[PDB]
């Protein structure tokens, strides 16, 4: 019924795909060293997953630190295409579904054209990485982002700025958030683009609109060619709305398991990572 994954890093292993460096510091030598370590850690995590009942992993945005930056000092596709082919071959042999979730500043619906361009360059890097990995069923998960005044205009800029991006559109799936975009609104945007919807259970509880969870899933699931993907997290009892607990609670697991209209891949988003009630 369910495949499980976790994002970016693994705690028992102390492996991460998300080392970076300060921009000061963005020289070929320094970037190569962090990227080397991130790629090594990617393999340790895929191999660990094979042995531990995990089938999903979110690669961290910093795998190749600053890859989409205007001043990135070398040809990273040329440097890493062979190693990424080999890592992806491993991922497939282990039945691992790969994904990526760009950062908070990725908004192709911004009113600032240079923010849009930088955001698209970050999406293109992520999509290229998935291609170099041969991640067929790979997911590039994106929030709809800031309303900058009008939600309506924002959304039409978003769709407009994504519609020509055919490699991004190969992996792109859209996600509901805890403040601006409920599952219903996301479903409309996704339809316009021809992409799947990822339902985040905690974002939905916080910002449900009219839909109960079961219904949000029932409508989101048909948007996938293959296996739907879901994001599961729990509210931390001590922190601001949207803060992820260390562990997903049993209550939240069973609310998800009860609401599922069919098989799904579940990305567990907990501070505990593979200890996340994953
Ligand atoms: Mn969240």
Automatic annotation (TrEMBL):
Location of N6-acetyllysine modifications: 229
UniProt keyword annotations, A-Z: DNA damage, DNA excision, DNA repair, Endonuclease, Hydrolase, Metal-binding, Nuclease, Plasmid
Single biological process term from Gene Ontology: response to UV
Gene3D superfamilies: Divalent-metal-dependent TIM barrel enzymes
Binding site for Mn(2+) 3: 200, 203, 244
Keyword Transcription regulation set for record: no
GO terms assigned for molecular function: endonuclease activity; hydrolase activity; metal ion binding
Modified residues (N6-carboxylysine): 229
NCBIfam families given in the database record: uvde (TIGR00629)
Sites where the protein binds Mn(2+) 2: 175, 200, 231, 269
Taxonomic lineage: Bacteria, Thermotogati, Deinococcota, Deinococci, Thermales
Residues that, per the record, bind Mn(2+) 1: 101, 143, 175
Database matches in InterPro entries: UvdE, Xyl_isomerase-like_sf
Listed Pfam families: UvdE
Name listed for the protein in its UniProt record: Probable UV endonuclease
Binding, Mn(2+) 4: 203, 244
């Amino acid at each position: 019924m369910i495949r499980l994954g976790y994002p970016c890093e693994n705690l028992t292993l102390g492996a991460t795909t998300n080392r970076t460096l300060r921009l000061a510091h963005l020289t070929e030598e320094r970037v190569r060293e962090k990227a080397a370590e991130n790629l090594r850690d990617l393999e340790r995590i895929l191999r660990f997953n094979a042995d531990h009942g995990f089938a999903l992993f979110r690669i961290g945005q910093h795998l190749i630190p600053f890859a989409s930056h205007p001043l990135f000092p070398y040809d990273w596709e040329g440097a890493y295409e062979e190693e990424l082919a080999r890592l992806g071959a491993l991922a497939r042999a282990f039945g691992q579904r790969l994904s990526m979730h760009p950062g908070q500043y990725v908004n192709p619906g911004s009113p600032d054209p240079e923010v849009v361009e930088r955001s698209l360059a970050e999406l293109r890097y992520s999509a290229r990485l998935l291609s170099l990995l041969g991640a067929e069923d790979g997911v590039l998960v994106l929030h709809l982002g800031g309303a900058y005044g009008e939600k309506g205009k924002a959304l039409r800029r978003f769709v407009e700025n994504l519609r020509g991006e055919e490699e991004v559109l190969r992996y792109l799936a859209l996600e509901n958030d805890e403040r601006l975009w409920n599952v219903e609104e996301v479903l409309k945007a996704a339809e316009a683009l021809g992409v799947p919807v990822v339902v985040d259970t905690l974002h939905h509880a916080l910002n449900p609109g009219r839909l109960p969870l079961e219904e949000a899933l029932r409508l989101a699931f048909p948007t996938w060619r293959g296996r739907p993907l879901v994001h599961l997290a729990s509210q931390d009892p001590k922190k601001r709305p949207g803060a992820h607990a260390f562990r997903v609670t049993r209550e939240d697991w069973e609310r998800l398991l009860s609401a599922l209209p069919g098989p799904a891949d579940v990305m567990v988003e907990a501070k505990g990572k593979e200890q996340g009630l994953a």
